[PDB]
Structures are given as C-alpha cells and as structure tokens.
Amino acid sequence: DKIIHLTDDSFDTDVLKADGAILVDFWAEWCACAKMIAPILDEIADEYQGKLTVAKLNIDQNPGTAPKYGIRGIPTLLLFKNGEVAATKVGALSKGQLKEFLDANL
Amino acid sequence: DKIIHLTDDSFDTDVLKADGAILVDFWAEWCACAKMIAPILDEIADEYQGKLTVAKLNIDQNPGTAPKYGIRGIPTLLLFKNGEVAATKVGALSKGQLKEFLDANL
C-alpha cells in the first residue's frame, strides 16, 4: 500500500510538481507483460522506501498522459527526479533488472 | 526461419485446416515483453519440428483473428490441434514453462 495510483489529472501534482524521485509504471490489463511486473513493483516500493515513490498509471482509464511522453509501448517505467524525467525502460523486466536500473540513477 | 507468420486470411488455411498441432503466438509491439522472450519461441520451433509448427500473428496488422477466440490479453499462446483449440496460456513464458506447457499437451 505504498504505491501511488495516478490519474491523468493528478499527474501534475503527484509527479511533475513533487520534490524527490518517482518511478512511474504505465500499464493496462490487456498487456500481460505489463501486469507481470506488478508483483515485482510491490517489492520495490517496500525496499526503496524513503528514497523513492512508486506510482502507477493505467493508460486505459487515463489516456492523456502517455502520448505526452511519446510512450508507444507498455509497460514503460518513467523515473522522474524533481519533476523531470531522468531515465526510461520499456518492456517487462525482472526484479533484478529493475533494481539495477534504479541503482544506476538514484 | 522456421516460424510461420500468419495474416488474418492465411489463418484458415495455415491453422484451421492443418491436421497436426499448431502453436499460435498472438502478439503486437504495443505490449513489449522481455528481450529474452523473442528467441525462445524460435528455439522451440526447432526442438519441436516433427510434431509442432510455430506461428506468430501480429494482431495490429491482422486485427481480425484475435476476437474470434476471445483474446483480451497479449501476448497469448493458442495451441491448436487438428484445427481446434486444445489449450491456451496468457503471458510471455520462459523456455521452461513453454516446454512444460507443450509436453503436457503434445
């Protein structure tokens, strides 16, 4: 219960105008690989508590944000630092790859 | 090389009329899965020649087929036998799970 659920409208304030690091997961029910990293994320939010905020945005109920970052495929992870994007990963990945990605930017 | 790429029209000929077992992977670039999952299916087409034919159907270039089998999530694997669905599995499975999946149905 540490993962934040974003909406197209709260994206400004929960992410863009928030100080600190936020990992944003762009997903949807119809993409199995997008849902297969959710378990992994639950673990990541716990282990990076205090140094990172994990957020999820279902693109089906919030279709306005993805195009704004030219996202063409899911899942896509957006590591935001103080409001601006720092790094991106496209495609499903193991917990280890995700951890590696975070460690190379936090 | 050994993987048959279908179209909504070659589907009847290449799958519904075939006497043996046909595995169809329903996919699209929209749902990007781990890089390692791509070559897995190619190795399987190899290992299982003699009893199986592997085929892929991009649902974005061929949006006609998926709905006739109630596919809502991708990627999806449809194992066809003599023209009739025998078993399915939703997601991007590892080489090991694919073998387990196939050996339990072939």
Q: Are B58 and B71 in contact (CB under 8 A)?
A: no
Task: Please tell me the total count of domains within chain B.
Answer: 1
Q: Which of B25, B31, B94 to mutate to test the interface with A (most CBs of A within 10 A)?
A: B31
CATH number, domain of B71, equals: 3.40.30.10
Handedness of CA B50, B52, B54, B55 (dihedral sign): positive
- Look at B34 and A93 and tell me if their CB atoms are within 8 Å: yes
How many beta-carbon contacts under 8 Å exist across A and B?
50
Q: What are the b/e assignments for B43-64, b being 16+ CB within 10 Å?
A: ebbeebeeebbbbbbbbeebee
Strand A21-27, strand A53-58: pairing: parallel
Strand partners, A53: A22
Determine the distance in angstroms separating the CA of B95 from the nearest CA of chain A, rounded to an integer. Answer: 15
Amino acid in the structure at residue A46 = D
CA distance readout (Å), A89 to A8, A54, A75, A95: 21, 14, 8, 13
Contacts of B91 in chain A (CB under 8 A): 32-33, 36
Contact B65, B91 (CB under 8 A): no
Tally Cβ neighbours within 10 Å of residue A105: 12
Whether A90 has its CB under 8 Å from any CB of chain B: the answer is: yes
Q: Is A91 on the interface with B (CB under 8 A)?
A: yes
Q: Where in the sequence is the domain holding A10, given as residue range(s)?
A: 1-106
Start-to-end CA span in chain B (Å): 22
Is B74 close to A34, i.e. CB distance below 8 A? no
Q: Cα(A52)–Cα(A50) distance, rounded to whole angstroms?
A: 6
CB A49 within 8 A of CB A42: no
Q: Residues near B62 by Cβ (< 8 Å), separated by ≥ 6?
A: B6, B7, B8, B11
**Interface contact flag, B73 A34, Cβ < 8 Å:** no
Nearest Cα residue in chain A from B93: A33
- Residue carrying structure tokens 């030219």: A70
C-alpha pair distances (Å), B57 with each of A2, B41, B73, B76: 38, 13, 14, 10
Contact B32 A74 (CB under 8 A): yes
Cβ contacts (< 8 Å) between A93 and chain B: which residues?
34
- From the centroid of its chain, how far is CA B89? 10
Q: At how many Å resolution was this determined?
A: 2.3
